[PDB]
């Protein structure tokens, strides 16, 4: 039981606006931020549903001032990961009552924290239905 | 010589069945068509607590027997027998009962089943797991 | 009004609480933890913290001391072997700074049992007469009947 | 954004009489923020904050319940006398609605150990 390695929603530098680690491989801030900077540097300023970083398929999207991440295994493809990443974007948008930017996330830090935990649970994909997550969470 | 020891006043409807709890014989429950089964003590005329065991009146009350089994069952004419835990006070599960008003329902002690009867002439046995 | 109700295991603390809240005599399990409930009596809303009396939990009561306006100490009047132990627990409880001004109400309980010690007997054994620093009262109770319970809530409300 | 010390500290009021679902839920959000933003909790204040929160489980509000699940898992390992929160989680877990159901099992089971395993089983089977 494992698909998603980690989820990060990063500003346009790779610094932690947010990350919640569905791996046990980053718990300390220094390394959680390093990871975040690492994934953001590869993936950014080339938007696609694919990136390969650290031998893992990284699926990412972007907004005005954020890049949104799911990191998962590379034995899969973008599309499986993408379903998590689409939930992540979508659910935060509907939850916060505003599209994902740094402003929406900061506006409601609580909605963001709770919403992401419903999407991924210890690296298993707990939820992937944006609607379900949003009802499930209370602001 | 069958003097009236105590009178219990609590039930506001037709008291269909009475059973004695086997963990305290001083306790019994009575089922009445008032949508409750009320657990009473001998000492107390009044029911010392009420359970709302069914929704269309309670025909029967039974305990699931034993030294470590606090259970009630309710049967009702809503076609259904309901299992309740008297310790936790929640309704453990609902049993389909019969395809017509459940006349009575009881617990088998040894076997994990509930045996119910209905006015459709049918008896059904349900696995209690 | 904030109330902490403690006593040794099996004294009748939860029975008391749910008699008060539900007018019902429930079938208890040992409380590994607390129960907390709000009870209305005569325009007062008592928030009662019933904290389990077995050893592991007994070690934890001190977290519930702070903010306590009154203390209900339940005693099983029928258990003579453990009365000294009750006395020991209660005495050092009386030394607790967070419990310093809290009203002290002892319930001598299971008064319904034939050999139950009397409230006077219990008062001597628990050393209640020697409390001069705050309000105390002892009340014979039977939590199953409800006897003495509201006399307790009454006394307490007059802190 | 935040300072871990101030937020871990002010949480201690829950342990006494105040339960205030709004205030406590906010304070909890702040804890989740300290971790999320990237900070490390101080153990004394954490241990204290954990014992305090369990009182907050009495009040059943879906946002407060939610805060409580994430915060106890994160604070579980950097806290003492956590065992008290099991009962409160079971109480929450049986309560019908996905907000309680799913998030509680996960928070409860994480804190739950072989002694406690037995307790969660009825609710788990359901």
Q: How far is it, in rounded angstroms, from Cα B11 to Cα B58? A: 11
Beta strand A4-11 with A66-72 is: antiparallel
- Tell me whether residue C68 is annotated as binding: no
Strand partners, A7: A20, A70
Q: State the Cα–Cα distance between residues D8 and D44, nearest whole angstrom.
A: 9
Q: What is the resolution of this structure in A?
A: 13.0
Residues 6+ positions from A94 with CB-CB distance below 8 Å = A130, A131, A134
Q: Is C54 a catalytic residue?
A: yes
Q: Residue D18, SS3?
A: coil
3-state class (DSSP) for residue D77: coil
Rounded CA separation B55/D117 (Å): 34
Query: Are D64 and D24 within 8 A, CB to CB?
Result: yes
Catalytic residue among C40, C54, C91, C139: C54
Alpha carbon C116 to chain centroid, angstroms: 17
Cα separation, A49 vs C79, in Å, equals 73
Q: What span, in angstroms and rounded, lies between the C-alpha atoms of A91 and A98?
A: 10
* Whole-number Å distance between alpha carbons of A13 and A15: 6
Nearest to C33 among D17, D51, D87 (CB): D87
Taking CB atoms and an 8 Å limit, are B49 and C22 in contact across chains?
yes
The angle at the Cα of C110, spanning C107 to C115, to the nearest 5 degrees, equals 120
Q: What gap in Å lies between CA A10 and CA A15, rounded to an integer?
A: 6
* Alpha carbons D126 and D121: distance in angstroms, whole number: 9
Residue D122 parent element (H or E): helix D117-125
Q: Do C29 and B87 touch (CB under 8 A)?
A: yes
Phi, psi of A2 (to 5 degrees): 180, 135
DSSP A23-84: SSS--SHHHHHHHHHHHHHHHSSS--S--EETTEEEEEEE-SSEEEEEEE-SSS-HHHHHHH
Q: How far is CA A55 from CA A39, A58, A76, B43, in A?
A: 12, 9, 12, 75
Q: Do A110 and D63 touch (CB under 8 A)?
A: yes
- The answer to whether B70 faces chain C, any CB pair under 8 Å, is yes
Give, in degrees to the nearest 5, the angle at Cα B65 between B62 and B69.
105
Are residues D58 and C36, on separate chains, in Cβ contact within 8 Å? yes
Cβ of B49 under 8 Å from any chain C Cβ? yes
List the one residue out of C79, C91, C92, C88 whose CA is nearest residue C11.
C79
Judged by a CB distance cut-off of 8 A, whether residue D67 touches chain A is: yes
Task: Answer whether D75's CB lies under 8 Å from D31's CB.
Answer: yes
| D69, D31 contact by CB (below 8 A) | no
For residues C46 and A44, give the distance between their C-alpha atoms in angstroms, rounded to a whole number. 60
Minimal CA–CA distance to C106: which of C157, C52, C36, C156? C156
- Give the number of other CB atoms < 10 A from CB of residue A36: 27
**Would you say C148 is a known binding-site residue?**
no
Identify from D14, D59, D83, D111 which residue to disrupt to test chain C contact, counting C C-beta atoms within 10 A and taking the largest count.
Answer: D83
Question: Within 13 Å of residue B94, how many CA atoms lie on the same side as its CB?
Answer: 10
Q: Is A136 in Cβ contact with D102 (below 8 Å)?
A: yes
Report which of A26, A61, A23 is spatially closest to residue A40, judged by C-alpha positions: A61
D32 touches chain A (CB under 8 A): yes
For strands C2-7 and C44-51, give the pairing: parallel
The two structure tokens encoding residue B18: 């009475």
Q: Determine the distance in angstroms separating the CA of A54 from the nearest CA of chain D, rounded to an integer.
A: 22
C76 is in an annotated binding site: no
- Out of C2, C47, C66, whose CB is closest to D15? C66
Whether residue B39 contacts residue B47, with contact meaning beta carbons closer than 8 Å, is answered with yes
Helix (H, G, I), strand (E, B) or coil at C107: strand
Q: How far apart are the first and last CA of chain D?
A: 41
Burial of A99 (0-12, 13-18, 19+ CB in 10 A): middle
Write out the H or E segment, with its range, that includes residue D73. Answer: helix D62-75
For residue C147, the cross-strand partners are C142
Name the 3-class secondary structure at C13: helix
For residue C70, give both structure tokens: 């009154």
Tell whether residue C9 is among the known ligand binding residues: yes
CB atoms within 10 A of CB D33: 20
The C-alpha atoms of residue D40 and residue D18 are separated, in whole angstroms, by 26
Q: Would you call D15 an interface residue with chain C, using a CB distance cutoff of 8 Å? A: yes
Q: Do D16 and C60 touch (CB under 8 A)?
A: no
Given a contact cutoff of 8 angstroms between Cβ atoms, the answer to whether D120 and D112 are in contact is yes
Spatial neighbors of D50 by CB under 8 A, at least 6 apart, are: D72, D75, D76, D79, D80, D81, D82, D85
What whole-number distance in Å separates Cα of residue D71 and Cα of residue D87? 17
Ramachandran assignment for B64, one of left (phi > 0), alpha (psi -120 to 50 degrees), beta (any other): beta
- Please count the CA atoms within 13 angstroms of the CA of C157 that sit on its side-chain side: 15
Residue D119, classed as helix, strand or coil, is helix
Half-sphere exposure for A135 (CA within 13 Å, toward CB) = 9
A 10 A CB-CB count for A107 gives 14
Structure tokens at C50: 């019933």
Sign, CA torsion C126/C132/C136/C139: positive
Within an 8 Å CB–CB cutoff, is residue B43 touching chain C? yes
Answer yes or no: is C108 a known binding residue.
Answer: no
Look at the block and give the residue holding tokens 């000492």.
B43
User: B95 forms bridges with which residues in the sheet?
Assistant: B81
Of B43, B49, B87, nearest to C24 by CB-CB distance is B49
Classify residue B77 by its DSSP letter. Answer: T
**Which among C120, A109, A94 is positioned nearest to D1, based on CA atoms?**
A109
The H or E element spanning position C105 is: strand C103-109
What is the distance between the alpha carbons of residues C104 and C72, in angstroms, rounded to a whole number?
6
Q: Are strands C103-109 and C136-140 parallel, antiparallel or unpaired?
A: parallel
Distance of residue B74 Cα from the nearest chain C Cα, in angstroms = 19
CA dist B95 and B79 (Å) reads 9
Q: State the Cα–Cα distance between residues C63 and D78, nearest whole angstrom.
A: 18
Asked whether D81 and C60 are in contact (CB, 8 A), the reply is yes
> Which residue among C2, C60, C63 places its CB closest to the CB of D17?
C2
DSSP state of C158: T
Return the half-sphere exposure (C-beta side, CA atoms, 13 A cut-off) of residue B81.
Answer: 28
Q: Please, where are the H alpha helices in C23-137?
A: 55-58, 62-65, 83-93, 119-126
Instruction: State phi, psi for D15 to the nearest 5 degrees.
Output: -60, -25
Strand, coil or helix: B107: strand
- Beta bridge partners of residue A11, listed in sequence order: A66
Distance of residue C83 Cα from the nearest chain D Cα, in angstroms: 27
Sheet holding B36-41, edge to edge: B15-21, B24-32, B36-41, B49-51
- CA gap D34, A29 in Å, rounded: 10
């Amino acid at each position: 039981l494992y698909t998603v390695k980690a989820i990060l929603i990063l500003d346009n530098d790779g610094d932690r606006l947010f990350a919640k680690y569905y791996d046990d491989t980053y718990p300390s801030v220094k390394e959680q931020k390093a990871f975040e900077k690492n994934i953001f540097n590869k993936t950014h300023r080339t938007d696609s549903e694919i990136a390969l970083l650290e031998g893992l398929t990284v699926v990412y999207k972007s907004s005005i001032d954020l890049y949104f991440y799911v990191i998962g295994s590379s034995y899969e493809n973008e599309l499986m990961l993408m379903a998590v990443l689409n939930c992540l974007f979508d659910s935060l948008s509907q939850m916060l009552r505003k599209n994902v930017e740094k402003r929406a996330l900061l506006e409601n830090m609580e909605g963001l924290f709770l919403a992401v935990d419903e999407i991924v649970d210890g690296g298993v994909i707990l939820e992937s239905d944006p609607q379900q997550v949003v009802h499930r969470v209370a602001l | 010589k069958w003097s009236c020891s105590q009178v219990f006043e609590g039930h506001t409807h037709y008291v269909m069945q009475i059973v004695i709890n086997p963990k305290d014989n001083n306790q019994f429950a009575s089922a009445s068509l008032d949508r409750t089964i009320k657990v009473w003590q001998l000492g107390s005329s009044s029911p010392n607590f009420t359970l709302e065991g069914h929704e269309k009146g309670v025909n029967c009350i039974d305990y699931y027997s034993g030294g470590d089994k606090p259970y009630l069952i309710s049967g009702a004419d809503d076609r259904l027998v309901k299992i309740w835990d008297y310790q936790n006070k929640t309704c453990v599960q609902t049993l389909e009962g019969h395809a017509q008003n459940v006349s009575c329902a009881s617990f088998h002690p040894e076997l994990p089943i509930i045996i119910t009867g209905s006015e459709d002439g049918t008896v059904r046995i349900w696995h209690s797991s | 009004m904030r109330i902490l109700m403690v006593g040794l295991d099996g004294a009748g603390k939860t029975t008391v609480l749910y008699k008060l809240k539900l007018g019902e005599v429930i079938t208890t399990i040992p409380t590994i933890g607390f129960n907390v409930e709000t009870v209305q009596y005569k325009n007062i809303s008592f928030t009662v913290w019933d904290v389990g009396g077995q050893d592991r939990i007994r070690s934890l009561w001190r977290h519930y001391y702070r903010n306590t306006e009154g203390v209900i100490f339940v005693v099983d009047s029928n258990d003579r072997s453990r009365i000294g132990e009750a006395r020991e627990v209660m005495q050092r409880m009386l030394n607790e700074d967070e419990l310093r001004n809290a009203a002290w109400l002892v319930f001598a309980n299971k008064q319904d049992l034939p050999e139950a010690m009397s409230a006077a007997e219990i008062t001597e054994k628990l050393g209640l007469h020697s409390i001069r620093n705050r309000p105390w009262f002892i009340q014979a109770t039977c939590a199953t009947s409800g006897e003495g319970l509201y006399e307790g809530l009454e006394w307490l409300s007059n802190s | 954004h935040l300072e871990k010390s101030a937020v871990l500290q002010e949480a201690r009021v829950f342990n006494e009489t105040p339960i205030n679902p709004r205030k406590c839920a906010h304070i909890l959000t702040k804890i989740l923020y300290l971790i999320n933003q990237g900070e490390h909790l101080g153990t004394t204040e954490a241990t204290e904050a954990f014992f305090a929160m369990t009182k907050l489980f009495q009040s059943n509000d879906p946002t407060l319940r939610r805060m409580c699940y994430l915060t106890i898992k994160e604070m579980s390992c950097i806290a003492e006398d956590v065992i008290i929160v099991t009962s409160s989680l079971t109480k929450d877990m049986t309560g019908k609605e996905d907000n309680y159901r799913g998030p509680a099992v996960r928070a409860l089971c994480q804190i739950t150990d072989s002694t406690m395993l037995q307790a969660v089983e009825r609710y788990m089977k359901q």
